[PDB]
Design an enzyme around this catalytic site. Structure first.
Site, short mmCIF file in Angstrom:
data_model
loop_
_atom_site.label_atom_id
_atom_site.label_comp_id
_atom_site.label_asym_id
_atom_site.label_seq_id
_atom_site.Cartn_x
_atom_site.Cartn_y
_atom_site.Cartn_z
N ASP A 1 -12.05 6.27 -4.81
CA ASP A 1 -10.92 5.79 -4.01
C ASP A 1 -9.75 5.36 -4.87
O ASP A 1 -9.67 4.26 -5.38
CB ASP A 1 -11.43 4.59 -3.22
CG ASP A 1 -10.44 4.17 -2.18
OD1 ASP A 1 -9.27 4.65 -2.22
OD2 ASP A 1 -10.83 3.34 -1.33
N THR A 2 -8.77 6.28 -5.00
CA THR A 2 -7.61 5.97 -5.85
C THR A 2 -6.74 4.91 -5.23
O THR A 2 -5.93 4.35 -5.95
CB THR A 2 -6.75 7.23 -6.08
OG1 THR A 2 -6.34 7.76 -4.80
CG2 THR A 2 -7.55 8.31 -6.80
N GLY A 3 -6.89 4.60 -3.95
CA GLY A 3 -6.15 3.52 -3.29
C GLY A 3 -6.80 2.19 -3.44
O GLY A 3 -6.22 1.21 -2.93
C1 LIG Z 1 -5.85 0.28 2.39
C2 LIG Z 1 -5.76 0.50 0.88
C3 LIG Z 1 -4.38 -0.04 0.42
C4 LIG Z 1 -6.86 -0.28 0.14
N1 LIG Z 1 -8.19 0.14 0.55
C5 LIG Z 1 -8.67 1.37 -0.05
C6 LIG Z 1 -8.63 2.51 0.96
O1 LIG Z 1 -8.87 3.76 0.30
C7 LIG Z 1 -9.56 2.31 2.15
C8 LIG Z 1 -11.02 2.62 1.72
C9 LIG Z 1 -11.92 2.44 2.94
C10 LIG Z 1 -12.45 3.58 3.55
C11 LIG Z 1 -13.24 3.46 4.67
F1 LIG Z 1 -13.78 4.53 5.28
C12 LIG Z 1 -13.52 2.20 5.20
C13 LIG Z 1 -12.98 1.09 4.57
F2 LIG Z 1 -13.25 -0.11 5.10
C14 LIG Z 1 -12.17 1.16 3.44
N2 LIG Z 1 -9.16 3.22 3.24
C15 LIG Z 1 -8.99 2.77 4.50
O2 LIG Z 1 -8.81 1.57 4.74
O3 LIG Z 1 -9.05 3.73 5.44
C16 LIG Z 1 -8.97 3.22 6.78
C17 LIG Z 1 -7.51 3.28 7.23
C18 LIG Z 1 -7.28 4.69 7.74
C19 LIG Z 1 -7.00 5.69 6.63
O4 LIG Z 1 -7.54 6.91 7.17
C20 LIG Z 1 -8.85 6.54 7.62
O5 LIG Z 1 -9.62 6.51 6.42
C21 LIG Z 1 -10.93 6.01 6.59
C22 LIG Z 1 -10.95 4.70 7.30
C23 LIG Z 1 -9.65 4.16 7.74
C24 LIG Z 1 -8.65 5.16 8.21
S1 LIG Z 1 -9.29 -1.06 0.69
O6 LIG Z 1 -10.57 -0.47 1.01
O7 LIG Z 1 -8.71 -1.98 1.71
C25 LIG Z 1 -9.38 -1.92 -0.82
C26 LIG Z 1 -10.32 -1.56 -1.79
C27 LIG Z 1 -10.36 -2.28 -2.97
C28 LIG Z 1 -9.46 -3.25 -3.23
N3 LIG Z 1 -9.36 -3.96 -4.38
C29 LIG Z 1 -8.49 -4.96 -4.37
N4 LIG Z 1 -8.34 -5.67 -5.45
C30 LIG Z 1 -7.36 -6.70 -5.66
C31 LIG Z 1 -6.04 -6.59 -4.91
C32 LIG Z 1 -7.13 -7.56 -4.45
S2 LIG Z 1 -7.77 -5.01 -2.80
C33 LIG Z 1 -8.64 -3.63 -2.22
C34 LIG Z 1 -8.59 -3.05 -1.03
#
Ligand SMILES: CC(C)CN(C[C@@H](O)[C@H](Cc1cc(F)cc(F)c1)NC(=O)O[C@H]1C[C@H]2CO[C@H]3OCC[C@@H]1[C@@H]23)S(=O)(=O)c1ccc2nc(NC3CC3)sc2c1
Ligand SMILES: [Cl-]
Ligand SMILES: [Cl-]
Ligand code: NA
EC number: 3.4.23.16
Lengths: 99, 99
Positions: free
Chosen positions: A25-27
């Site tokens: 996860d590059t995000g």
């Molecule tokens: C939103 C993004 C800025 C950050 N996220 C990483 C994403 O790639 C996240 C990874 C993730 C996937 C998943 F399947 C379920 C999750 F709970 C988290 N994607 C989504 O939120 O997708 C969601 C939002 C939509 C995007 O398209 C779809 O993708 C799959 C699920 C959702 C929709 S995360 O998971 O919230 C994340 C991970 C590590 C991380 N590390 C942090 N470190 C320091 C700053 C505090 S904050 C932080 C936040």
């Protein structure tokens, strides 16, 4: 390897003696794993994303094997919906995004 | 380009004639952008992030440029903390993960 993005980029990891599936996860700045025990000390942390924040335990200097590549770094443990390999470990295995 | 992951993979996008910053996010299935105005009708979608679920507005077939690469596809609009370019558009610009 070259991983296309037609599907979620899931890989097998080994952490804490356990095999898990996790998302490259590059995000994600950090690596976040579902509840498990890890040795050593930890401290609490809040991390936020879509839908708000969750509380996690931060463990430092944890060895992980990610798709066969060993790395060490911080791992956050808590109620994440999906196991996430974030940039702190993706850099260590030499992962890049290419287009 | 080849983008390493020592810093967040932020790029400029252009949507509705306006430039915005967004995160290239292989852990996102879909593209989610902060509140803005887009043409046409929208449909409802619920997306689950690390903190829980949020409601977004789904707009289909939106013209969007990502780091200079032209795409046309679905954009979700809602209260996301960061603009994220997910796999639906990463695939349109030919992105892969490599290590
Ligand atoms: C939103 C993004 C800025 C950050 N996220 C990483 C994403 O790639 C996240 C990874 C993730 C996937 C998943 F399947 C379920 C999750 F709970 C988290 N994607 C989504 O939120 O997708 C969601 C939002 C939509 C995007 O398209 C779809 O993708 C799959 C699920 C959702 C929709 S995360 O998971 O919230 C994340 C991970 C590590 C991380 N590390 C942090 N470190 C320091 C700053 C505090 S904050 C932080 C936040
Ligand atoms: Cl680290
Ligand atoms: Cl490097
Ligand atoms: Na430790």
């Amino acid at each position: 390897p070259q991983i296309t993005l037609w599907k979620r980029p899931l890989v097998t990891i080994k952490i804490g003696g356990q095999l898990k599936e996790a998302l490259l996860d590059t995000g994600a700045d950090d690596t976040v794993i579902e509840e498990m025990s890890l040795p050593g000390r930890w401290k609490p942390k809040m991390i936020g994303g879509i839908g708000g924040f969750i509380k996690v335990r931060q463990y430092d200097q944890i060895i992980i094997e990610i798709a066969g590549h060993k790395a060490i770094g911080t791992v956050l443990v808590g109620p994440t919906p999906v196991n996430i390999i974030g940039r702190n470990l993706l850099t260590q295995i030499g992962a890049t995004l290419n287009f």
